[PDB]
Amino acid sequence: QKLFVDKIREYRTKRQTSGGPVDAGPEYQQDLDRELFKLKQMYGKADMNTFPNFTFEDPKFEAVEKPQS
Amino acid sequence: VTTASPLDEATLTELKTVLKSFLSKGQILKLEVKVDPSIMGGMIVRIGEKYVDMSAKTKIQKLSRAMR
């Protein structure tokens, strides 16, 4: 369990990292940006803080001349 | 037994005695100590045909945390 305790210590040290998910990873920023761009492209254009408002109209059937008794 | 460079002779005779206790069937077993730098702080013991494993594979079992 002592090896497991050492693993727990390493996990705790990673937890206390002030930079959080930095890990000294130069490609972490690039990978995160690529993932975000892919997610945005898949979901399409959107706004982080906005509401959906729209209006529409429907024209009924136009009158057609028809004479009869 | 294949963990690393051999430890003190006291640990060697302790593991020999515990292996004898494992056998404990009116018989005497032979011993073959190996060295493996790849294997981490743990050791792997094959007492006959059993082959317990507490070695670098313990760090491999960390994939459970990696998985979920």
Side-chain angles (χ1 to χ4, degrees), chain B residues 29-62:
Chain B
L29 51 88
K30 52 187 302 299
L31 186 70
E32 296 179 7
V33 180
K34 309 302 194 312
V35 177
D36 193 357
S38 299
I39 290 301
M40 303 310 174
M43 71 298 299
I44 45 179
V45 184
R46 181 207 310 275
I47 41 263
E49 211 179 13
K50 312 308 292 181
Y51 187 77
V52 297
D53 190 299
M54 43 297 178
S55 62
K57 296 186 183 300
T58 56
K59 280 75 60 182
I60 299 181
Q61 293 186 5
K62 293 175 51 188

